[PDB]
Design a protein around this ligand. Structure first.
Ligand SMILES: OCc1ccc2c(c1)OCCO2
Ligand code: NI
Ligand code: NI
Length: 330
């Protein structure tokens, strides 16, 4: 109930934080895994913002309050949590650094912030669940239900005293950046990904894709958001596999609630159907992840390492299906 706010100790601590020198080099790479460095995650975000947008893009105090308050409004759920927020932001940083001048200063700061915020106050339940059981949120937001809520949470945090990192923008640039963030967060609704990707593949293959056309830009940015949101599938296999365990803990908890409401879940959400998981992953990679990174690589050639890693992980799920897995730790 209400919007949570960080403590003075929390944001002052982030302000004083210094990143270890060895990580500077690592943070630039797509395959970088934030996993082993939990205490450093908010500092890693400050560092990314500073490298991409400059140390004077945001007032430091407001930025540190914003970040630690964003952390506090992520819930202690197995997957859609603070750790996922930072992984997705780190992916966008790597895409931006590799394609820096294609995007405006306004886009870069808006997109890094949109990624950190894009799953804010997630409860561990899908849009499917919310709409099936008529949660109050599905009443307010008929489509892209959680994603409209995530944007609303983003705006609530900007409105806390001393948290508005965008105040110093011109009134016109302020409206523009909030629209960038809104569109980017809405785009993380995978329901919209399928149409967006299909349209982009068409525009690319006919050569009509034009980044000077606002509706095209919006679409490319949309696909960036998908690519960052799904980026666990572009890490090294052990990291990808561990994250999948977290995703499924959420799914299985949702399916458990459905059974309580008299309805059997989709197999993916049924903890009594774990044998079906590897085939389900194969279907997910073939239908979503591979086409996403394939199209993104056509449009932004330097994102190619995301696609190569995704392909390597598809191969590992194929090994699992064939019974060729080796020892795994949980
Ligand atoms: O982050 C990778 C990822 C996101 C969503 C998924 C997923 C993996 O696998 C099963 C369906 O949903
Ligand atoms: Ni989401
Ligand atoms: Ni997400």
């Amino acid at each position: 109930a209400g919007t949570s706010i960080c403590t003075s100790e929390e944001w002052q601590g982030l302000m004083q934080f210094t990143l270890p020198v060895r990580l500077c080099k690592e943070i630039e790479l797509f395959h970088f895994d934030i996993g082993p460095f939990e205490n450093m995650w908010p500092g890693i975000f400050v560092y990314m913002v500073h490298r991409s947008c400059g140390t004077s893009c945001f007032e430091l105090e407001k930025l540190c309050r914003f970040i630690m308050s964003v952390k506090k409004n992520y819930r202690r759920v197995p997957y859609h949590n603070w750790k996922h927020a930072v992984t997705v932001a780190h992916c966008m940083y790597a895409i931006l650094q590799n394609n820096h001048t294609l995007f405006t200063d306004l886009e870069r700061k808006g997109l890094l912030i949109a990624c950190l915020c894009h799953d804010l106050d997630h409860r561990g339940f899908s849009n499917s669940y919310l709409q099936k059981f008529d949660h109050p949120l599905a009443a307010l937001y008929s489509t892209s239900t959680m994603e409209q809520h995530h944007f609303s949470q983003t705006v609530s945090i900007l409105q806390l005293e001393g948290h508005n990192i965008f105040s110093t923008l011109s009134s016109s640039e302020y409206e523009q950046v909030l629209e960038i963030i809104r569109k980017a967060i809405i785009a993380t609704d995978l329901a919209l990904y399928f149409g967006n990707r299909k349209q982009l593949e068409e525009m690319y293959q006919t050569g009509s894709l034009n980044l000077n056309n606002q509706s095209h830009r919006d679409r490319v940015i949309g696909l960036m958001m998908t690519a960052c949101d799904l980026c666990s599938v572009t890490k090294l296999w052990p990291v990808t596999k561990l994250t999948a365990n977290d995703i499924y803990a959420e799914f299985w908890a949702e399916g458990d609630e459905m059974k309580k409401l008299g309805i059997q879940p989709i197999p993916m959400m049924d903890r009594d159907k774990k044998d079906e998981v590897p085939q389900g992953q194969l279907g997910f990679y073939n239908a979503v992840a591979i086409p996403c990174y394939t199209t993104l690589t056509q449009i932004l050639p330097p994102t190619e390492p995301l696609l190569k890693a995704c392909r390597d992980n598809l191969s590992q799920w194929e090994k699992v299906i064939r019974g060729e897995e080796t020892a795994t730790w949980i």
